[PDB]
C-alpha cells in the first residue's frame, strides 16, 4: 500500500521535524534527543495505525471526486498524515499514561514503557506528557495558515478532554458511585448494581470512541474541507456506534484471546472492570450463579480467575455477542444510508472503516 | 484587596461552568461531579496565586492608563481572572504529576494528592491529565469570540512543552547525559561535571521560568491588546531572568527552610539534584571538599545528608547568594529600565512582580 508509505514517510517528516527543533530551539542535547527519538518510536509505532489511517482513507475518498490541482492534492494527502499522527501521538500519550496507573507488564509483546530500564514512571509520566504536547506542536506547525486550524484544535482538545473523563469512568467502575471519596479508600462493589448495559455504553462511549472513531473521521473532513457536506449527526452517532463494537471485541479478547496473540496477558477479570462480558453474564444468569460470579470476581487468585472465565464460557456469551455483532451490523447499515443522502463517497468511506472494524 | 477577591470568585464561576458542563454534556453522575470537586479544590487552591495575580495586575495597569466603557473594563478584568486561572491550573497539573514521578510526601502541608485514601496513583495520574485539559475547555468557552485566542492558545502551548522539556533535564540531571538510554538503567553521576551554571541555567529556565514568569506576563498582555504596546524581546529577557531568580530562592529553601513553614520535608541533597546550591558549592570548594561532597552528595542517609548540608554552611553559600541577588537586581532594574522606552505602565508592572518575588 501506498497510503501506508506516505504515512510511515510523514513520520520520518515529523520526528526530524519535532527533533531538530528540540536542538535548535530548547537547548537539546545529542543524548536526550536521541532518548526522546527512541521513545516515540516505542510508543507511537507498531499498531495497526487504524486511527490514523482512517483520515488518510476519508480525504482520499473526497480526493477522488474533487477537482484539484496536483499540487493541492499532495498538500492535503500532507495534511491527513499528519492529522492521523496527531491522533496516533494522542492514543500513545494514553497508553505510556494507562500502563503506569493500572501497574501493566506487557503491550503489543514488549515491556510497557515505564519498564524500560532506563526510563522509570519518574520519566515515562512526563514522556507521556511530552507526547500529547507534541501532537500540538504539529498542529501548530504545519497548520499555522489553514482555515480548518481552530476548529481542529477545538475538536482535538474536546476528544481529548472526553477520553480523560472516560478512563476516570472506567478505573473507578468496580466502585460503588455513592461510596466515591477521595478522603476514602475506594472498596469493590458487593452488589454489582451499575454493572447494567447503559452504564458500561457511558464508559465506553467516553473512554474510546471519541478518539477512536469520532476524531479520526471527522479529521478526514476538515483537512478535505468537506464538513458542511456531512450531517454531524449522523457521523457522531456512527462513530459512537462502531466505537462501542470495537470496545466489546477487545473485552472479548481480554478474556479469551491467548496472551501470545493479544501481546498482553489481559487482566479484566481481577481488576473487577465492567466489562461486556461482565455486563452480559449478569444480564443472563441465574441466582446460583450471580452469587458464584460474586465469590470469585475481582481477585488476582488465577482459580478464582479460572472460575469466572469457566462461568463465561458456561453461560454461552458467545451467542450473545453474534447477537449483538447482527444488531450493530444492521444500525450501521442503516447509518451508512442515511449518509448517502448528502455524501456517498464519506459514507463509503464509513463503510471501509466498519468493514476493517468488523474483520479481527 | 478587591483584585484577590475578583480572582477569587472567578474561580467560583469557573468550577461551576466545568461541573455543570460534566452534568450536562458528559452524563456525570454527582459522586463523581463531587470528586472532581473536590480534587480541583486540593490541587489549585491554597497558594499564593502570584501567577494568576500577574495576569490581573498587567491588565489593570493598561486600564488606569486606556480608555474604555465599563462593560470593557469588566470584560478585561473577567479576560485576566480566567487567564490567570488557566495558568493556576496548568501548575497544578504539573504539581500532581511531578508529586507522583518524585514520590513526594506532602505539598502546602497536607499529603500530596495521589496519597489521598481515595484518590491513589491511579486515579491521580488522569486527575493531573485533566486539570490541563480544565485550562483548554476554558479558553474555548471563555475566550471563543476574542482577537487574542489563536495567540494565547498558541504561546500557551509553547509554554506547556518547554515545562514538560524543562522536566526532563530536571529529573536526569544527576546522570551523565552520554550515559542517558531507556535501555539501561541511569547510574548517578560521579563526576558532577554536568553540574555548571550554564547547565543549571538552562535547567531552571525551560522547567520554571516560562510558566511562572512568561506566560503571566504575555497573557496579561494579551487580554489587554496590548503585545504591540511592548519589545517581546525584553519581556522574554526579563522573565527568564526573575525566573532563575525564583528557583535559585527555592533551592536554598528547600536545604535550609524549616519543614513547618515550607510545607515540604526537601529532599533535593538525597535526590542528587542539580541545585544553585550544589553548583555554587563546586564552583567555590577546594579539593577536599569536592571529595568529600562526592562522598556523601545523593544518598537517603539523614548522616550523609548532614555532611553536605554542613560543607553548604561552612563554604558560607548566603554569600554568593547576596552576590548573586546583587547582580539580579542590576540586570533587572536595567531591563525594567529599557522597558519604560516603549510602555512605561507595563514596565511598572514589571517592577511590582519583581519586588514581590525579591521579598520571601
Redesign the interface.
Given at each position: 500500500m501506498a497510503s501506508m508509505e506516505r504515512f510511515l514517510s510523514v513520520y520520518d517528516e515529523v520526528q526530524a521535524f519535532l527533533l531538530d527543533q528540540?536542538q535548535s530551539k530548547?537547548?537539546?542535547?545529542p543524548?536526550?534527543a536521541?532518548?526522546l527519538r527512541?521513545?516515540m518510536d516505542?510508543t507511537c509505532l507498531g499498531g495497526k495505525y487504524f486511527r490514523g489511517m482512517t483520515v488518510v482513507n476519508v480525504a482520499e475518498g473526497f480526493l477522488a471526486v474533487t477537482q484539484h490541482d496536483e499540487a493541492t492534492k499532495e498538500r492535503i494527502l500532507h495534511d491527513a498524515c499528519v492529522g492521523g499522527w496527531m491522533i496516533e501521538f494522542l492514543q500513545a500519550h494514553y497508553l505510556v499514561?494507562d500502563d503506569?496507573?493500572?501497574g501493566s507488564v506487557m503491550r503489543r509483546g514488549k515491556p510497557c514503557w515505564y519498564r524500560?530500564?532506563?526510563?522509570?514512571?519518574?520519566?515515562a509520566?512526563?514522556?507521556g506528557?511530552?507526547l500529547k504536547?507534541?501532537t500540538?506542536?504539529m498542529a501548530?506547525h504545519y497548520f499555522a495558515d489553514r482555515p480548518f486550524?481552530?476548529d481542529l484544535?477545538?475538536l482535538f482538545?474536546?476528544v481529548?478532554?472526553?477520553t480523560?473523563?472516560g478512563?476516570?469512568?472506567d478505573?473507578?467502575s468496580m466502585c460503588d458511585?455513592?461510596?466515591?471519596?477521595?478522603?476514602?479508600?475506594?472498596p469493590m462493589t458487593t452488589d454489582f448494581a451499575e454493572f447494567t448495559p447503559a452504564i458500561y455504553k457511558?464508559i465506553v462511549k467516553?473512554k474510546t470512541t471519541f478518539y477512536t472513531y469520532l476524531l479520526p473521521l471527522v479529521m478526514g473532513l476538515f483537512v478535505s474541507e468537506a464538513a458542511a457536506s456531512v450531517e454531524m449527526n449522523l457521523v457522531e452517532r456512527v462513530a459512537h456506534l462502531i466505537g462501542e463494537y470495537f470496545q466489546v471485541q477487545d473485552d472479548v479478547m481480554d478474556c479469551f484471546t491467548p496472551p501470545e496473540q493479544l501481546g498482553k496477558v489481559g487482566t479484566d477479570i481481577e481488576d473487577a472492570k465492567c466489562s461486556w462480558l461482565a455486563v452480559t453474564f449478569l444480564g443472563k444468569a441465574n441466582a446460583a450463579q450471580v452469587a458464584e460470579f460474586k465469590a470469585n470476581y475481582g481477585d488476582k487468585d488465577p482459580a478464582k480467575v479460572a472460575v469466572v472465565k469457566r462461568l463465561y464460557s458456561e453461560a454461552n456469551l458467545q451467542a450473545d455477542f453474534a447477537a449483538y455483532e447482527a444488531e450493530v451490523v444492521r444500525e450501521v447499515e442503516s447509518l451508512i444510508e442515511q449518509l448517502k443522502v448528502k455524501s456517498p463517497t464519506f459514507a463509503e468511506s464509513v463503510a471501509v472503516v466498519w468493514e476493517k472494524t468488523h474483520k479481527r
Open positions: 528540540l530548547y537547548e537539546i542535547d543524548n536526550r536521541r532518548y527512541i521513545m516505542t499514561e503506569i496507573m493500572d524500560f530500564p532506563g526510563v522509570t514512571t519518574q520519566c509520566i512526563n514522556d506528557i511530552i504536547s507534541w500540538q506542536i501548530w486550524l481552530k484544535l477545538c482538545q474536546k481529548d478532554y472526553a480523560a473523563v478512563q476516570m469512568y478505573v473507578t458511585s455513592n461510596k466515591l471519596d477521595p478522603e476514602v479508600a475506594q457511558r467516553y
